[PDB]
Design a protein around this nucleic acid. Structure first.
Ligand SMILES: [K+]
Ligand SMILES: [Mg+2]
Ligand SMILES: [Mg+2]
Ligand SMILES: [Mg+2]
Ligand SMILES: [Mg+2]
Ligand SMILES: [Mg+2]
Lengths: 97, 205, 181, 142, 51, 32, 152, 124
RNA sequence: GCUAAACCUAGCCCCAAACCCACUCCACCUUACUACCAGACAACCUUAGCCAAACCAUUUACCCAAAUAAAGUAUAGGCGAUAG
């Protein structure tokens, strides 16, 4: 029980597709390109995460002030609750002071 | 009418038959079979068209296609790639063995040129008249759509009108004279019904 | 007579009854209104005979002789009804210019959603109708929040629907790489 | 060898149940020792033209050869025949072929058993044939 | 406590496929011999008399 | 394979449509 | 007619006339013993006994003296695999009595003699099964399960 | 314990509820004093059944017919078939004026008609 | 060897992008889903509190329309907690 009786299908991986063979390219766009572009500008994803890093509380705060006016009513309500909970947890709970 | 589950699995039996319901009850949910998306225009295999089996138990054999299932891209050849099953089995009688055809995918069969009984690939083109036809890649020749019996089975060439069938002289006679009167107005003229009373205004809201 | 509710006695008990095709919409456009009006009851009396036979088939627990006969009549009835309505709709546009026979309007209900209100016919005008005035055709500002909630609910359904399709296409190329090529 | 995959190419779909059903869980040791008289084509009769879109032809062949049959039950115990001593068999084999089908071939169809045929070899074990079961109200009749 | 066995399959007929179907069963062999052959009585004696 | 064309800083001034409500107000003033 | 808007009537207004009707009735065999003149129909819910009286007289030229109608409830007890109730549609039953003393008896629409085909019928698939079953015989008990295919 | 997901019909409720709810049949009269119902003859829809004696058309159509393409009727098509021929004859003669459009068949208003087009005051 | 045990999809999550839906006929604010009669009834008004301050009583963060930086700075505050 809890363990399969048959081997899973083989995992064929193409190590030389377009995405893998060209991974890491242009990561030196600034140093080798007269600093016209920045390697963090190559990053794709949420507009509140491009070229930025932080903990969960900072990510929620940054997300709320950038795309908060575009979030759905239920999603925005959940984000506000998460910020309220994280504020109390980090600033009032823990082992170190 | 038609009541199909969202992930209904098409099979050899037609939908709605007694065996189909038992094979596919409304509550069962099986893994959907992956089907290569082929447009209806790009499909080039029809019923009654001889095709050659490329891969299977009997490869390189040519047989007539009796049925095609577009949902699973299936082609059935009569008497080819057939297994055996006992039909009409009862408690006392073992049964009678009959050859049952197995469906073949469109990639496992290849159309044969009418001039040369060899498998070949075809591409759609247009003739001078504009009628769309299928033309073989090698030694391009016209491959007409084979004649197949209609689903209902009625043959126009051997049809005798019944007592409740309108004749062709009466079903095609043109009696409509376009005018600016409705059916209700026109019928009261023929029936002769007279109504001097005038309809009163009614508020609509 | 009541004999018109049943088929010919010689046809009673037979397994199959030969019947022709159903009238098509183009074949019915060559007939006049008087001819279509007469043809309407020819098909109607035939339809009552088929409904009577079908019910007795279930009563006797036997299959209907020619079930396809009922489908042909139903198609004939719908096609004939389509032709008559189309002629009146075309004539209504020529004389009045209205694309709908029944009056109506676009009004917001009490729930804030746009609906097509079909007008009814009343003897008295609308400002004197006690029952009509109790109905509310305006939404108060407290409904605007629920309108957004319903809009966002539709967005999630559409977002899931669009995302699922792209998942199917990407997975379907794994087993059939020739599709991409 | 239970090679039912190839047996379908040698016998028809009607002949197959008669051959394999009774030997499903039994072992058969059959061999062809010697042939006494060459086979002769006794009767050839074809089907009516286009009965169902296909035309069938049947050829009757008479064979009289010695054969050896050894049948063992599911547990390997001897059940019928002797594996050592062959005996003559006189049987009329009827063949068939679907003439309309281009890929058809002549396959064994059935065996003609004449009414004057001698009784077959008796089996090794004994058998019992029970009489009719009688309910209490029913009375037996001799 | 409302769960019940999935005993719902019912008997059906295997003699004939569904009606009004273009596809029909393809038969490779006929059921029986078109004309029965009756070998002459005493043909076993003729086996010895090869001539 | 061949790598995609390098990302370059698109030359020329960027003038957004002033009639677009998604245009930030700081890209339509004299300072911009 | 059903599913249509009836024009409103006021005093002195024109006669209401319907040229094409969508009412379809079906004659049914009563489940209980009925008087000879009584005829039973199934009519749509929107149909009245006044409309049915003119429906039979106007279309089938059947003189009718009395029409009595009742609404039959369709059972909602059936449940599918999802424990959701399945509703049998409600229908209206109409009892029509003939006018001039005529008697109506529901005919036998499936006579046994007419069902039996006098002409010979030979289905290819059925003929295959019938012949083989007659040819094949049960195993001889004295043979004790030994196959009869072998002639030895 | 009441079923709120079943259709509410006249068979449910007390006596006052059951008698007030109907089945969809149109009313053909009104109730007067003393619970006496007065049926209005003009409110009862009268069936206009034509004479079917010697009628050629039959419920079914023989299969030996050409497969004509379907051409839906349009207002532009109907105008050309019906009104256009009359206008052309009058246009060539030279007696044409917008004041006489009522003579060609045009109806400026639907009032005073037995069968008004919009809103229609006749059944199907 | 019974009961069982195993499985790979259904679909979903987070982003990007782009501003979404609702008249086929009939019915639906009266007891919704009910063909068909004198109404006059009309909408708008600070959130609070939990919680933190180891009680609590002033007070205690809650996107308001540019990421970053100025800056947790100037300020505010039982000049406490904290806010900014
Ligand atoms: K406390
Ligand atoms: Mg902490
Ligand atoms: Mg009653
Ligand atoms: Mg409840
Ligand atoms: Mg506290
Ligand atoms: Mg306390």
């Amino acid at each position: 029980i809890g363990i399969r009786l048959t081997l899973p299908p083989p995992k064929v991986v193409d190590r030389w597709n377009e995405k893998r063979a060209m991974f890491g390219v242009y990561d030196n766009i600034g140093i080798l390109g007269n600093f016209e572009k920045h390697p963090k500008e190559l990053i794709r994803g949420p507009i509140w995460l491009r070229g930025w890093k932080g903990n969960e509380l900072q990510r929620c705060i940054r997300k709320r002030k950038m795309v908060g006016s575009r979030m759905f009513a239920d999603d925005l309500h959940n984000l506000n609750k998460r910020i309220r909970y994280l504020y109390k947890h980090f600033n009032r709970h823990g082992k170190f002071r | 009418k038609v009541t199909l589950p969202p992930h209904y699995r098409y099979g050899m039996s037609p939908p709605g038959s007694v065996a189909d319901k038992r094979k596919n009850p409304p509550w069962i949910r099986r893994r959907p079979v992956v089907v290569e998306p082929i447009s209806d225009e790009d499909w080039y295999l029809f019923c009654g068209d001889t095709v050659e089996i490329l891969e299977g138990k009997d490869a390189g054999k040519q047989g007539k296609v009796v049925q095609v299932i577009r949902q699973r891209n299936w082609v059935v050849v009569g008497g080819l790639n057939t297994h055996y099953r006992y039909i009409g089995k009862t408690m006392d009688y073992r049964g009678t063995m009959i050859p049952s055809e197995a469906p073949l995918l469109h990639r496992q069969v290849k159309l044969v040129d009418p001039m040369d009984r060899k498998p070949t690939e075809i591409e759609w083109r247009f003739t001078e008249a504009g009628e769309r036809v299928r033309v073989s890649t090698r030694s391009g020749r016209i491959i007409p759509k084979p004649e197949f019996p209609r689903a209902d089975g009625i043959v126009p060439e051997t049809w005798i009108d019944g007592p409740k069938d309108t004749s062709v002289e009466d079903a095609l006679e043109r009696t409509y004279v376009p005018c600016l009167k409705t059916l209700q107005e026109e019928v009261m003229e023929a029936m002769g019904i007279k109504e001097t009373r005038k309809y009163k205004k009614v508020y609509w809201y | 007579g009541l004999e018109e509710f049943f088929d010919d006695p010689k046809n009673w008990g037979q397994e199959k009854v030969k019947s022709g095709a159903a009238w098509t919409c183009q074949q019915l456009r060559n007939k006049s209104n008087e001819d279509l009006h007469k043809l309407w009851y020819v098909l109607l009396k035939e339809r009552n005979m088929l409904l009577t036979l079908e019910q007795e088939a279930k009563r006797q627990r036997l299959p209907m002789p020619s079930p396809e006969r009922l489908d042909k009549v139903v198609d004939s009835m719908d096609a004939l009804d389509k032709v008559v309505q189309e002629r009146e709709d075309a004539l209504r546009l020529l004389q009045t210019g209205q694309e709908r026979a029944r009056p109506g309007a676009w009004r917001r209900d009490i729930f804030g959603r746009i609906i097509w209100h079909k007008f009814k016919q009343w003897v008295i005008p609308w400002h004197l109708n006690k029952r009509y005035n109790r109905k509310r055709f305006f939404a108060l500002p407290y409904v605007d929040h629920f309108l957004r909630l319903e809009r966002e609910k539709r967005a999630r359904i559409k977002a899931r629907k669009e995302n699922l399709e792209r998942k199917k296409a990407k997975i379907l190329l794994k087993k059939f790489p020739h599709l991409a090529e | 060898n239970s090679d039912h995959d190839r047996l379908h190419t040698l016998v028809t779909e009607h002949c197959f149940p008669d051959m394999t059903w009774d030997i499903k869980y039994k072992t058969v040791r059959w061999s062809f020792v010697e042939s006494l008289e060459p086979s002769h084509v006794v009767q050839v009769r074809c089907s009516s033209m286009m009965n169902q879109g296909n035309v069938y032809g049947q050829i009757t062949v008479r064979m009289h050869t010695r054969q050896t049959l050894a049948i063992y039950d599911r547990f390997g115990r001897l059940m019928y025949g002797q594996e050592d001593v062959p005996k003559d068999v006189l049987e009329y084999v009827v063949f068939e072929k679907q003439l309309t089908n281009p890929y058809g071939s002549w396959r064994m169809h059935t065996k003609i058993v004449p009414p004057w045929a001698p009784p077959k070899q008796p089996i090794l074990k004994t058998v019992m044939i029970p009489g009719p079961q009688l309910k209490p109200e029913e009375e037996y009749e001799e | 406590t409302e769960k019940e066995f999935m005993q719902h399959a019912r008997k059906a007929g295997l003699v004939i496929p569904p009606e009004k179907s273009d596809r029909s069963i393809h038969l490779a062999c006929t059921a029986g011999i078109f004309d029965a052959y009756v070998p002459p009585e005493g043909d076993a004696r003729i086996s010895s008399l090869s001539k | 394979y061949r790598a995609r064309p390098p990302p370059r800083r698109r030359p020329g001034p960027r003038w957004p449509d002033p009639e677009d409500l998604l245009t930030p107000r700081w890209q339509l003033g004299p300072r911009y | 007619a059903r599913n249509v808007v009836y024009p409103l009537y006021r005093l002195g207004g024109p006669q209401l006339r319907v040229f094409r009707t969508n009412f379809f009735i079906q004659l049914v065999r009563p489940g209980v013993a009925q008087p000879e003149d009584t005829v039973q129909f199934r009519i749509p819910m929107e149909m009245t006994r006044v409309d049915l009286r003119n429906y039979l007289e106007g279309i089938y030229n059947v003189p009718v003296a009395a029409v009595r109608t009742r609404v039959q409830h369709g059972s909602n007890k059936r449940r599918d695999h999802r424990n959701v109730r399945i509703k049998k549609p409600d229908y209206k039953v109409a009892y029509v009595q003939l006018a001039h003393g005529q008697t109506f008896t529901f005919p036998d629409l499936f006579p046994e003699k007419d069902e039996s085909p006098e002409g010979s019928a030979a289905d290819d698939l059925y003929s295959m099964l019938e012949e083989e079953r007659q040819q094949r015989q049960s195993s001889d008990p004295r043979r004790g399960g030994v196959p009869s295919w072998f002639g030895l | 314990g009441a079923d709120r997901m079943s259709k509410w019909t006249s068979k449910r409720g007390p006596r006052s509820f059951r008698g007030r709810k109907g089945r969809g049949a149109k009313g053909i009269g009104f109730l007067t004093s003393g619970w006496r119902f007065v049926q209005i003859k003009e409110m009862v829809p009268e069936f206009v059944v034509p004479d079917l004696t010697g009628f050629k058309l039959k419920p079914y159509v023989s299969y030996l017919a050409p497969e004509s393409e379907e051409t839906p009727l349009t207002a532009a098509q109907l105008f050309s078939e019906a009104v256009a021929p009359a206008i052309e004859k009058d246009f060539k003669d030279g007696t044409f004026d917008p004041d006489n459009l009522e003579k060609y068949g045009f109806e400026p208003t639907q009032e005073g008609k037995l069968f008004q087009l919009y809103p229609r005051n006749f059944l199907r």
